[PDB]
Design a protein around this ligand. Structure first.
Ligand SMILES: *[C@@H]1O[C@H](CO)[C@@H](O[C@@H]2O[C@H](CO)[C@@H](O)[C@H](O)[C@H]2NC(C)=O)[C@H](O)[C@H]1NC(C)=O
Ligand SMILES: *[C@@H]1O[C@H](CO)[C@@H](O[C@@H]2O[C@H](CO)[C@@H](O)[C@H](O)[C@H]2NC(C)=O)[C@H](O)[C@H]1NC(C)=O
Ligand SMILES: *[C@@H]1O[C@H](CO)[C@@H](O[C@@H]2O[C@H](CO)[C@@H](O)[C@H](O)[C@H]2NC(C)=O)[C@H](O)[C@H]1NC(C)=O
Ligand SMILES: *[C@@H]1O[C@H](CO)[C@@H](O[C@@H]2O[C@H](CO)[C@@H](O)[C@H](O)[C@H]2NC(C)=O)[C@H](O)[C@H]1NC(C)=O
Ligand SMILES: *[C@@H]1O[C@H](CO)[C@@H](O)[C@H](O)[C@H]1NC(C)=O
Ligand SMILES: *[C@@H]1O[C@H](CO)[C@@H](O)[C@H](O)[C@H]1NC(C)=O
Ligand SMILES: *[C@@H]1O[C@H](CO)[C@@H](O)[C@H](O)[C@H]1NC(C)=O
Lengths: 118, 408, 187
């Protein structure tokens, strides 16, 4: 987010200044995201290239009023999905963490109400 | 009671999908351009990079959300040149060549409704054109291809048959549509316009995604308005303390200010962290309401709008998404005497899929959600057993189609 | 981060507590220990708060996993895109370190091919609609397939029904509908 006339090729994005990345003019499914539709990636003697990201190959479904397409074959596809279910059961004792075998600190901690039980 | 007529209704649902990204520097806020607040802030430990690590997590998930919602299609479909869809004209949810930023006549009146101190506002990853192009791909892929552009490649099917094979899901047959195509088409057209009227007249509906920008600008206002508060010290202007009290009095005064500002910033970060959970809870509901209602036909009740849901269209909106559920609500009723089973020649003819009804002299076998009465034959009814166990059995006559054929 | 916060200073003259108690007896040990206790207590409170929020996240995900294991695995979900991309057949759960992993089996149509169609058929005045399936034409003859598999078969009266007269259906097509009863009559 700086108009990069004011810095110590050189591309000028909508999200800031991107120094050291070539602004190619084609478009690809992007690897590293930056912002405002601009991504960067490593491709072809090699260098880094920044561009505007793509959304997908165009498809003009030939819609007519008396035409229907019906598949002739299938293909069983088996995929995967991953989900977390739990995280490690970590428990911390207040008095050891705060004072640490230091009764002369526990006496002071006593005055602070009950900021251990909760 | 069995309906005689029906009405098509096109309701609306509005959900918020993502907040506005933000990132607050630590020491430019706590110690505004000063060096006597380096020593007095290195004392406290890893506070800064905790606050600068929670905010980026929120900022990245707020952009994962809008990519998990709208990017469920794989390719960008487009409609044929203008239109041919039977009698339905989506001439006012579809994109238009004018208005350079491709955007339709509804999601334009949706955008024309919600019109630096250490604070930075990062831009979203998908600009407002890319979301509008996703919501046009998902719109041009359902008008032209039906159920089956989410399974795999898009299979064409004429729209009349699409809307006809969508009734056969909720329960009614296809003749009910084909002999009432004009009625349903002109009921659908004169029901889309009410959305235009309701949205243009007042901002009654778009409150769900407005009380969000009205709440992310209260915390962001307090965060900067609590810079002018002594917190229990001689002054709030840093330079004034820096000048008036040179010896180790500035230490205690600036410690009081630093503690106050650090506490305020921490309680801003915590509030953002909690508030960014309900936004994701609604973004996870939008994704599963757009997989199911748009790319298919849900048989859950009251999920995709009240009634019998049969189609829907997505429309974008500033940090939000709007649907246009289409339902099938029956209408003017009648009342008929009924019977759980007929009784022809000792046996009990149950109805295959329907209800026996009467008028005073005759009997028929109709559907659930419409009144087309056929005549009871051994092609509408299946025999099971004898004629005593069933409670409510009646006695009647059941026609047989093959019998009036042997004579010639 | 919680552990690393112990080495910090917070404004006292040292971070290790015993050394403070090993240099300063009556009140000044206490004036330093006040700062130490305040700082450590705030760090602990912050840690507990993000732990609570993260646990809420995890519980939401775990409820989602429970729903998936109840619906994809035991039954057969019709909710599209819920259990995989396509038409759902089965699923097989697999354990994982602090999580669960599913294996969604799915039917996926492919190798399409297009035909001219028709919403119905006139024959002797009455417009015939298909019971279950669609009408098609392979170029010259009209058949009645199913939805997701081109398995054409002769149009008859055992797979098409009758409603009214072909005057209101828009896009009707002439044909002949075969009656199985007619051939078996000369006995
Ligand atoms: C489906 O689209 C075709 C487009 O070819 C329509 O055919 C047109 O029909 C009208 C009136 O019958 C003719 O005046 C045009 O000349 C036809 N088009 C061409 C290119 O010759 C057809 O009518 C459409 N289906 C229906 C039911 O209207
Ligand atoms: C459906 O697709 C399968 C591929 O999965 C086709 O199987 C091929 O069939 C041809 C013709 O008999 C064989 O020569 C190939 O060796 C088969 N390959 C595989 C991988 O099975 C099947 O024929 C297709 N069905 C139709 C009707 O074309
Ligand atoms: C698909 O259409 C073709 C015509 O292009 C049909 O071919 C003929 O069908 C008649 C049916 O009465 C047969 O008697 C002929 O023998 C067929 N031609 C040849 C060269 O065998 C074809 O029958 C149609 N498809 C099906 C399944 O019938
Ligand atoms: C389908 O066939 C029928 C009968 O063969 C056609 O019905 C014609 O209807 C007109 C006006 O009602 C009559 O003048 C003709 O005598 C009828 N028969 C014929 C052979 O034309 C009907 O027109 C045919 N369908 C289409 C689309 O033409
Ligand atoms: C940066 O400043 C120059 C100086 O006028 C201006 O011409 C240019 O447009 C500015 N950059 C942007 C992105 O506006
Ligand atoms: C891409 O090429 C066109 C053609 O000259 C030019 O107008 C446009 O500015 C180029 N864009 C970039 C990013 O180089
Ligand atoms: C099938 O579609 C292709 C283009 O998608 C078209 O050229 C062809 O004529 C179609 N077949 C029929 C029988 O209409």
């Amino acid at each position: 987010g700086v108009n990069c006339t004011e810095v110590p090729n050189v591309f000028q994005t909508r999200a800031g200044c991107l120094i050291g990345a070539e602004h190619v003019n084609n478009s690809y499914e992007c690897d590293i995201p930056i912002g405002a539709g601009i991504c960067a990636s490593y491709q072809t003697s090699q260098s880094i290239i920044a561009y505007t990201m793509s959304l997908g190959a165009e498809n003009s479904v030939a819609y007519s009023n008396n035409s229907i397409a019906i598949p002739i074959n299938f293909t069983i596809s088996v995929t995967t999905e991953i989900l977390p279910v739990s995280m490690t059961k970590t428990s911390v004792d207040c008095t050891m963490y705060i004072c640490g075998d230091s009764t002369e600190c526990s006496n002071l901690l006593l005055q602070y109400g009950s900021f251990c039980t909760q | 009671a069995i309906p005689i007529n029906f009405t098509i209704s096109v309701t609306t649902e509005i959900l918020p999908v993502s907040m506005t990204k933000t990132s607050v520097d630590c020491t430019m806020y706590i110690c505004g351009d000063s060096t006597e607040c380096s020593n007095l802030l290195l004392q406290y430990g890893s506070f800064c990079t905790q606050l600068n690590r929670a905010l980026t997590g929120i900022a990245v998930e707020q952009d994962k959300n809008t990519q998990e919602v709208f990017a469920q299609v794989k390719q960008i479909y487009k409609t044929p040149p203008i239109k041919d869809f039977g009698g339905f004209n989506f001439s006012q949810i579809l994109p238009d060549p004018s208005k350079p930023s491709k955007r339709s006549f509804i999601e334009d009146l949706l955008f024309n409704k919600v019109t630096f101190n250490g604070l930075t506002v990062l831009p979203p990853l998908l600009t407002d054109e890319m979301i509008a192009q996703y919501t046009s791909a998902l719109l041009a892929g359902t008008i032209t291809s039906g159920w089956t552009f989410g399974a795999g490649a898009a299979l064409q099917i004429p729209f009349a048959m699409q809307m006809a094979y969508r009734f056969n899901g909720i329960g009614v047959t296809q003749n009910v549509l084909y002999e009432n195509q004009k009625l349903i088409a002109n009921q659908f057209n004169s029901a889309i316009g009410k959305i235009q009227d309701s949205l243009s007249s007042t901002a009654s509906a778009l409150g769900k995604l407005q009380d969000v920008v009205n709440q992310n600008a209260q915390a962001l206002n307090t965060l900067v308005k609590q810079l002018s508060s002594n917190f229990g010290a001689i002054s709030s202007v840093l330079n004034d303390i820096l000048a008036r009290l040179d010896p180790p009095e500035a230490e205690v005064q600036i410690d009081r200010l630093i503690t106050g500002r650090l506490q305020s910033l921490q309680t801003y970060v915590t509030q953002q962290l909690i508030r960014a959970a309900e936004i994701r809870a609604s973004a996870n509901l939008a994704a599963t309401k757009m997989s199911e209602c748009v790319l298919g036909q849900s048989k859950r009740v009251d999920f995709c709008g009240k009634g019998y849901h049969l189609m829907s269209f997505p429309q974008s909106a500033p940090h939000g998404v709007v649907f246009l559920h289409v339902t099938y609500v029956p209408a003017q009723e009648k009342n008929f005497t009924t019977a759980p089973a007929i009784c022809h020649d000792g046996k009990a003819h149950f109805p295959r899929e329907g209800v026996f009804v009467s008028n005073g002299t005759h009997w028929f076998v109709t559907q659930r959600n419409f009144y087309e009465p056929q005549i009871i034959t051994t092609h509408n009814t299946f025999v099971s057993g004898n004629c005593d166990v069933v409670i409510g059995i009646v006695n009647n006559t059941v026609y047989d189609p093959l019998q009036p054929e042997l004579d010639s």
